[PDB]
Short mmCIF file of all heavy atoms in Angstrom, two decimals:
data_model
loop_
_atom_site.label_atom_id
_atom_site.label_comp_id
_atom_site.label_asym_id
_atom_site.label_seq_id
_atom_site.Cartn_x
_atom_site.Cartn_y
_atom_site.Cartn_z
N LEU A 1 0.83 -1.20 -0.01
CA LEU A 1 0.02 -0.01 -0.01
C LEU A 1 0.84 1.21 0.02
O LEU A 1 0.62 2.19 -0.75
CB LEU A 1 -0.95 -0.03 1.20
CG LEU A 1 -2.12 -0.99 1.08
CD1 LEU A 1 -2.64 -1.34 2.38
CD2 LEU A 1 -3.23 -0.37 0.16
N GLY A 2 1.93 1.26 0.86
CA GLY A 2 2.86 2.36 0.92
C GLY A 2 3.54 2.69 -0.41
O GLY A 2 3.69 3.88 -0.73
N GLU A 3 3.93 1.68 -1.09
CA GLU A 3 4.55 1.95 -2.43
C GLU A 3 3.72 2.66 -3.37
O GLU A 3 4.18 3.39 -4.31
CB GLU A 3 5.06 0.60 -3.09
CG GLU A 3 6.17 -0.10 -2.25
CD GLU A 3 7.51 0.54 -2.30
OE1 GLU A 3 7.74 1.61 -2.93
OE2 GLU A 3 8.41 0.05 -1.63
N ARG A 4 2.34 2.43 -3.32
CA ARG A 4 1.38 3.10 -4.25
C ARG A 4 0.97 4.48 -3.69
O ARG A 4 0.81 5.42 -4.46
CB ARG A 4 0.10 2.20 -4.37
CG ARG A 4 0.28 0.77 -4.80
CD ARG A 4 1.46 0.58 -5.70
NE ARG A 4 1.35 -0.75 -6.35
CZ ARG A 4 1.91 -1.88 -5.83
NH1 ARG A 4 2.41 -1.94 -4.60
NH2 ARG A 4 1.76 -3.02 -6.63
N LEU A 5 0.86 4.62 -2.43
CA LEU A 5 0.49 5.88 -1.78
C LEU A 5 1.61 6.88 -1.82
O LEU A 5 1.36 8.15 -1.99
CB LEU A 5 0.13 5.65 -0.32
CG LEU A 5 -1.26 5.09 -0.13
CD1 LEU A 5 -1.34 4.47 1.26
CD2 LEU A 5 -2.40 6.03 -0.31
N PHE A 6 2.85 6.37 -1.65
CA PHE A 6 4.02 7.34 -1.45
C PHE A 6 4.20 8.36 -2.64
O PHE A 6 4.36 9.54 -2.29
CB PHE A 6 5.29 6.55 -1.24
CG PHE A 6 6.49 7.38 -1.00
CD1 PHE A 6 6.84 8.03 0.17
CD2 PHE A 6 7.33 7.69 -2.14
CE1 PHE A 6 7.93 8.84 0.34
CE2 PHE A 6 8.43 8.50 -2.02
CZ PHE A 6 8.73 9.14 -0.76
N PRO A 7 4.19 7.91 -3.89
CA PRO A 7 4.40 8.93 -4.92
C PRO A 7 3.37 10.03 -4.91
O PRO A 7 3.65 11.23 -5.22
CB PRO A 7 4.34 8.12 -6.23
CG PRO A 7 4.29 6.71 -5.89
CD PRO A 7 3.99 6.54 -4.41
N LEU A 8 2.14 9.67 -4.50
CA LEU A 8 1.06 10.64 -4.50
C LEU A 8 1.24 11.65 -3.28
O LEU A 8 1.12 12.82 -3.48
CB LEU A 8 -0.31 9.92 -4.42
CG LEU A 8 -0.56 8.91 -5.48
CD1 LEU A 8 -1.89 8.19 -5.30
CD2 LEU A 8 -0.54 9.53 -6.94
N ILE A 9 1.49 11.03 -2.14
CA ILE A 9 1.72 11.87 -0.98
C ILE A 9 3.00 12.75 -1.15
O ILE A 9 2.95 13.87 -0.72
CB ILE A 9 1.76 10.94 0.30
CG1 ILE A 9 0.41 10.29 0.47
CG2 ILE A 9 2.23 11.83 1.52
CD1 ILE A 9 0.40 9.21 1.60
N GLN A 10 4.01 12.22 -1.77
CA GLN A 10 5.25 12.92 -1.99
C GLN A 10 4.90 14.07 -2.91
O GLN A 10 5.47 15.15 -2.79
CB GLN A 10 6.29 12.01 -2.64
CG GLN A 10 7.54 12.73 -2.89
CD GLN A 10 8.57 11.86 -3.65
OE1 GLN A 10 8.21 11.26 -4.68
NE2 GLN A 10 9.70 11.78 -3.15
N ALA A 11 4.00 13.92 -3.95
CA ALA A 11 3.67 15.03 -4.85
C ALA A 11 3.08 16.10 -4.04
O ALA A 11 3.38 17.35 -4.33
CB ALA A 11 2.82 14.51 -5.97
N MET A 12 2.20 15.79 -3.07
CA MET A 12 1.48 16.77 -2.24
C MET A 12 2.41 17.50 -1.31
O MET A 12 2.34 18.72 -1.23
CB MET A 12 0.35 16.07 -1.55
CG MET A 12 -0.61 15.23 -2.55
SD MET A 12 -1.46 13.87 -1.74
CE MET A 12 -2.77 14.82 -0.97
N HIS A 13 3.27 16.78 -0.65
CA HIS A 13 4.17 17.35 0.38
C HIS A 13 5.53 16.70 0.27
O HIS A 13 5.85 15.76 1.08
CB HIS A 13 3.52 17.21 1.76
CG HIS A 13 2.19 17.87 1.95
ND1 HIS A 13 2.13 19.21 2.13
CD2 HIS A 13 0.98 17.43 1.82
CE1 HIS A 13 0.86 19.59 2.11
NE2 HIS A 13 0.13 18.48 1.94
N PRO A 14 6.40 17.14 -0.67
CA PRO A 14 7.67 16.48 -0.86
C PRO A 14 8.50 16.42 0.49
O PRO A 14 9.17 15.43 0.65
CB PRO A 14 8.36 17.43 -1.88
CG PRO A 14 7.19 17.94 -2.64
CD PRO A 14 6.11 18.18 -1.68
N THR A 15 8.45 17.46 1.31
CA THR A 15 9.38 17.45 2.45
C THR A 15 8.84 16.53 3.63
O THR A 15 9.63 16.30 4.54
CB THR A 15 9.58 18.86 3.06
OG1 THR A 15 8.32 19.38 3.56
CG2 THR A 15 10.07 19.79 1.95
N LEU A 16 7.61 16.04 3.53
CA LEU A 16 7.03 15.34 4.61
C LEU A 16 6.58 13.89 4.24
O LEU A 16 5.89 13.19 4.94
CB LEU A 16 5.74 16.02 5.07
CG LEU A 16 5.85 17.52 5.48
CD1 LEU A 16 4.44 18.11 5.81
CD2 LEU A 16 6.78 17.60 6.71
N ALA A 17 6.97 13.55 3.02
CA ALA A 17 6.45 12.40 2.31
C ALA A 17 6.47 11.10 3.11
O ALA A 17 5.52 10.38 3.24
CB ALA A 17 7.08 12.21 0.88
N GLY A 18 7.76 10.81 3.61
CA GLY A 18 7.90 9.50 4.33
C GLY A 18 7.12 9.51 5.64
O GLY A 18 6.52 8.44 5.93
N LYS A 19 7.04 10.61 6.33
CA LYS A 19 6.38 10.73 7.60
C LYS A 19 4.81 10.64 7.41
O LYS A 19 4.18 9.86 8.11
CB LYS A 19 6.74 11.98 8.29
CG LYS A 19 6.27 12.00 9.74
CD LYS A 19 6.96 11.02 10.62
CE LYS A 19 6.81 11.24 12.05
NZ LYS A 19 7.43 10.23 12.94
N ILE A 20 4.32 11.40 6.44
CA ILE A 20 2.86 11.35 6.20
C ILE A 20 2.39 10.01 5.69
O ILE A 20 1.34 9.50 6.13
CB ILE A 20 2.43 12.49 5.21
CG1 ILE A 20 2.74 13.88 5.78
CG2 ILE A 20 0.95 12.40 4.86
CD1 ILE A 20 2.01 14.22 7.10
N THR A 21 3.18 9.40 4.85
CA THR A 21 2.86 8.01 4.36
C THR A 21 2.84 7.06 5.54
O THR A 21 1.91 6.28 5.67
CB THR A 21 3.80 7.51 3.28
OG1 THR A 21 3.79 8.43 2.26
CG2 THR A 21 3.35 6.19 2.75
N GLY A 22 3.78 7.16 6.42
CA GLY A 22 3.88 6.27 7.64
C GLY A 22 2.64 6.48 8.53
O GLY A 22 2.10 5.47 9.06
N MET A 23 2.23 7.71 8.69
CA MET A 23 1.00 7.95 9.53
C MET A 23 -0.20 7.36 8.83
O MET A 23 -1.01 6.68 9.50
CB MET A 23 0.90 9.52 9.67
CG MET A 23 1.94 10.13 10.42
SD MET A 23 1.77 11.99 10.51
CE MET A 23 0.24 12.21 11.32
N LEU A 24 -0.31 7.55 7.54
CA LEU A 24 -1.52 6.98 6.87
C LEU A 24 -1.57 5.46 6.91
O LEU A 24 -2.66 4.88 6.90
CB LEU A 24 -1.71 7.60 5.49
CG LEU A 24 -2.60 8.75 5.32
CD1 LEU A 24 -2.20 9.94 6.21
CD2 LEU A 24 -2.70 9.28 3.90
N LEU A 25 -0.41 4.88 6.89
CA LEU A 25 -0.39 3.42 6.77
C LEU A 25 -0.88 2.64 8.01
O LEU A 25 -1.18 1.49 7.91
CB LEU A 25 1.05 2.94 6.48
CG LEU A 25 1.54 3.09 5.02
CD1 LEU A 25 2.97 2.75 4.90
CD2 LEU A 25 0.67 2.10 4.12
N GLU A 26 -1.05 3.43 9.08
CA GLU A 26 -1.70 2.84 10.31
C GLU A 26 -3.22 2.65 10.14
O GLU A 26 -3.83 1.96 10.94
CB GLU A 26 -1.28 3.62 11.58
CG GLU A 26 0.17 3.64 11.87
CD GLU A 26 0.47 4.03 13.35
OE1 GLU A 26 -0.49 4.51 13.99
OE2 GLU A 26 1.70 3.90 13.71
N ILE A 27 -3.76 3.34 9.11
CA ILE A 27 -5.20 3.20 8.87
C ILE A 27 -5.58 1.82 8.31
O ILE A 27 -4.71 1.15 7.71
CB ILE A 27 -5.65 4.28 7.82
CG1 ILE A 27 -5.50 5.70 8.36
CG2 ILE A 27 -7.10 4.12 7.33
CD1 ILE A 27 -5.65 6.77 7.37
N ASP A 28 -6.80 1.34 8.51
CA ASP A 28 -7.20 0.01 8.01
C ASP A 28 -6.99 -0.16 6.51
O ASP A 28 -7.20 0.87 5.75
CB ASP A 28 -8.71 -0.21 8.26
CG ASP A 28 -9.05 -0.45 9.71
OD1 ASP A 28 -8.18 -0.43 10.59
OD2 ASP A 28 -10.30 -0.64 10.02
N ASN A 29 -6.51 -1.31 6.07
CA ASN A 29 -6.23 -1.48 4.66
C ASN A 29 -7.37 -1.15 3.73
O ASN A 29 -7.21 -0.75 2.62
CB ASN A 29 -5.67 -2.92 4.34
CG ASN A 29 -4.33 -3.22 5.02
OD1 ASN A 29 -3.96 -4.35 5.03
ND2 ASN A 29 -3.65 -2.13 5.47
N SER A 30 -8.63 -1.47 4.22
CA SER A 30 -9.76 -1.26 3.35
C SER A 30 -9.91 0.20 3.08
O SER A 30 -10.19 0.59 1.92
CB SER A 30 -11.09 -1.81 3.95
OG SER A 30 -11.35 -1.24 5.19
N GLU A 31 -9.73 1.04 4.07
CA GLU A 31 -9.85 2.47 3.85
C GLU A 31 -8.69 3.01 2.98
O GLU A 31 -8.87 3.88 2.09
CB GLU A 31 -9.84 3.25 5.18
CG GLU A 31 -10.11 4.73 4.97
CD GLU A 31 -10.31 5.52 6.32
OE1 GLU A 31 -10.55 4.87 7.35
OE2 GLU A 31 -10.31 6.78 6.27
N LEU A 32 -7.43 2.40 3.18
CA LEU A 32 -6.30 2.81 2.29
C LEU A 32 -6.58 2.42 0.80
O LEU A 32 -6.22 3.22 -0.08
CB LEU A 32 -5.00 2.18 2.77
CG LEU A 32 -4.56 2.71 4.17
CD1 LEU A 32 -3.36 1.91 4.68
CD2 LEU A 32 -4.17 4.21 4.08
N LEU A 33 -7.14 1.24 0.56
CA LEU A 33 -7.44 0.83 -0.80
C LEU A 33 -8.41 1.88 -1.42
O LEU A 33 -8.29 2.34 -2.60
CB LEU A 33 -8.09 -0.50 -0.92
CG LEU A 33 -7.12 -1.78 -0.74
CD1 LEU A 33 -7.90 -3.02 -0.54
CD2 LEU A 33 -6.20 -1.81 -1.99
N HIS A 34 -9.39 2.32 -0.63
CA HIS A 34 -10.39 3.35 -1.10
C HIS A 34 -9.63 4.62 -1.49
O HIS A 34 -9.99 5.29 -2.46
CB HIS A 34 -11.36 3.58 -0.04
CG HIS A 34 -12.24 4.84 -0.29
ND1 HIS A 34 -12.01 6.06 0.26
CD2 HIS A 34 -13.30 4.92 -1.10
CE1 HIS A 34 -12.87 6.88 -0.18
NE2 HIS A 34 -13.66 6.28 -1.05
N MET A 35 -8.71 5.01 -0.56
CA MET A 35 -8.03 6.29 -0.81
C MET A 35 -7.21 6.20 -2.10
O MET A 35 -7.05 7.27 -2.74
CB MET A 35 -7.07 6.59 0.33
CG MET A 35 -7.72 7.32 1.48
SD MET A 35 -6.54 7.64 2.73
CE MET A 35 -7.19 6.52 3.94
N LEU A 36 -6.66 5.09 -2.43
CA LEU A 36 -5.90 4.94 -3.68
C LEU A 36 -6.81 5.12 -4.94
O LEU A 36 -6.29 5.43 -5.98
CB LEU A 36 -5.19 3.55 -3.76
CG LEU A 36 -3.87 3.57 -2.95
CD1 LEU A 36 -3.45 2.10 -2.76
CD2 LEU A 36 -2.82 4.30 -3.70
N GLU A 37 -8.11 4.99 -4.70
CA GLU A 37 -9.04 5.17 -5.82
C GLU A 37 -9.83 6.52 -5.75
O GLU A 37 -10.58 6.83 -6.62
CB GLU A 37 -10.09 4.05 -5.83
CG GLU A 37 -9.56 2.83 -6.55
CD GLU A 37 -9.57 2.99 -8.02
OE1 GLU A 37 -10.60 2.69 -8.67
OE2 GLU A 37 -8.44 3.41 -8.63
N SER A 38 -9.61 7.24 -4.69
CA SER A 38 -10.35 8.51 -4.43
C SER A 38 -9.40 9.62 -4.06
O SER A 38 -9.05 9.83 -2.90
CB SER A 38 -11.38 8.21 -3.34
OG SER A 38 -12.03 9.38 -2.84
N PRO A 39 -9.00 10.39 -5.09
CA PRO A 39 -8.15 11.52 -4.81
C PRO A 39 -8.62 12.50 -3.73
O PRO A 39 -7.84 12.98 -2.93
CB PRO A 39 -8.04 12.21 -6.16
CG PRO A 39 -8.16 11.03 -7.14
CD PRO A 39 -9.26 10.22 -6.52
N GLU A 40 -9.89 12.80 -3.70
CA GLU A 40 -10.41 13.74 -2.63
C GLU A 40 -10.26 13.16 -1.33
O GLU A 40 -9.91 13.84 -0.32
CB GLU A 40 -11.86 14.08 -2.91
CG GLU A 40 -12.16 14.99 -4.11
CD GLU A 40 -11.97 16.51 -3.75
OE1 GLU A 40 -11.52 16.81 -2.63
OE2 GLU A 40 -12.24 17.32 -4.60
N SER A 41 -10.56 11.83 -1.18
CA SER A 41 -10.39 11.16 0.09
C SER A 41 -8.89 11.21 0.64
O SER A 41 -8.61 11.52 1.78
CB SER A 41 -10.85 9.78 0.09
OG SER A 41 -12.27 9.64 -0.13
N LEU A 42 -7.94 10.89 -0.34
CA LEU A 42 -6.58 10.98 0.03
C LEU A 42 -6.24 12.42 0.36
O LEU A 42 -5.48 12.57 1.41
CB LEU A 42 -5.73 10.45 -1.15
CG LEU A 42 -4.19 10.42 -0.85
CD1 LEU A 42 -3.88 9.52 0.34
CD2 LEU A 42 -3.42 10.02 -2.05
N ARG A 43 -6.68 13.37 -0.36
CA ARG A 43 -6.38 14.78 -0.08
C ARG A 43 -6.86 15.15 1.33
O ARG A 43 -6.10 15.85 2.09
CB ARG A 43 -6.94 15.68 -1.18
CG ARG A 43 -6.88 17.13 -0.86
CD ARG A 43 -5.53 17.78 -0.93
NE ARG A 43 -5.55 19.14 -0.40
CZ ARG A 43 -5.82 20.23 -1.10
NH1 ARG A 43 -6.03 20.21 -2.37
NH2 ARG A 43 -5.94 21.39 -0.44
N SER A 44 -8.05 14.74 1.69
CA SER A 44 -8.55 15.12 3.03
C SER A 44 -7.73 14.49 4.11
O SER A 44 -7.44 15.13 5.14
CB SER A 44 -10.04 14.65 3.15
OG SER A 44 -10.54 15.01 4.38
N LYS A 45 -7.39 13.21 3.92
CA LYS A 45 -6.57 12.56 4.98
C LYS A 45 -5.20 13.05 5.06
O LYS A 45 -4.64 13.18 6.24
CB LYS A 45 -6.61 11.02 4.69
CG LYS A 45 -6.16 10.18 5.90
CD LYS A 45 -7.05 10.44 7.16
CE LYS A 45 -8.48 9.91 7.02
NZ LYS A 45 -9.13 10.05 8.29
N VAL A 46 -4.57 13.40 3.96
CA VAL A 46 -3.25 14.00 3.99
C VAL A 46 -3.33 15.37 4.65
O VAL A 46 -2.39 15.72 5.46
CB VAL A 46 -2.61 14.08 2.62
CG1 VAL A 46 -1.43 14.96 2.58
CG2 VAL A 46 -2.28 12.66 2.08
N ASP A 47 -4.29 16.18 4.30
CA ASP A 47 -4.50 17.50 4.97
C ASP A 47 -4.49 17.32 6.49
O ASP A 47 -3.87 18.05 7.23
CB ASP A 47 -5.77 18.24 4.49
CG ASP A 47 -5.62 18.76 3.13
OD1 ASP A 47 -4.45 18.77 2.57
OD2 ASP A 47 -6.62 19.27 2.54
N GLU A 48 -5.26 16.28 6.91
CA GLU A 48 -5.37 16.01 8.40
C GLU A 48 -4.02 15.66 8.97
O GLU A 48 -3.60 16.13 10.02
CB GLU A 48 -6.43 14.94 8.60
CG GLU A 48 -6.66 14.62 10.05
CD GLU A 48 -7.83 13.59 10.20
OE1 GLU A 48 -8.50 13.34 9.20
OE2 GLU A 48 -8.01 13.13 11.32
#
């Protein structure tokens, strides 16, 4: 999941990419799969 999320999160916040991806990876996998298909959902969670 991290390998697929990372380039997107990195695009959003290059300086925080590893840390933000690590934070998000603690979320349930089902929600992470959804985020990989829903840019707005990913954007909301990354903003948080």
Side-chain angles (χ1 to χ4, degrees):
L1 285 158
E3 296 289 356
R4 305 330 193 275
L5 286 162
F6 178 84
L8 305 176
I9 296 172
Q10 180 186 53
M12 307 155 77
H13 299 281
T15 65
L16 307 174
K19 191 68 166 176
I20 299 297
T21 303
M23 295 173 62
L24 264 58
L25 280 173
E26 298 197 351
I27 295 168
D28 289 1
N29 292 167
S30 59
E31 187 173 347
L32 293 171
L33 284 168
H34 167 263
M35 273 183 251
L36 279 165
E37 277 285 273
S38 172
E40 289 276 7
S41 292
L42 181 62
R43 169 73 192 269
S44 184
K45 196 57 68 173
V46 168
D47 284 352
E48 184 175 349

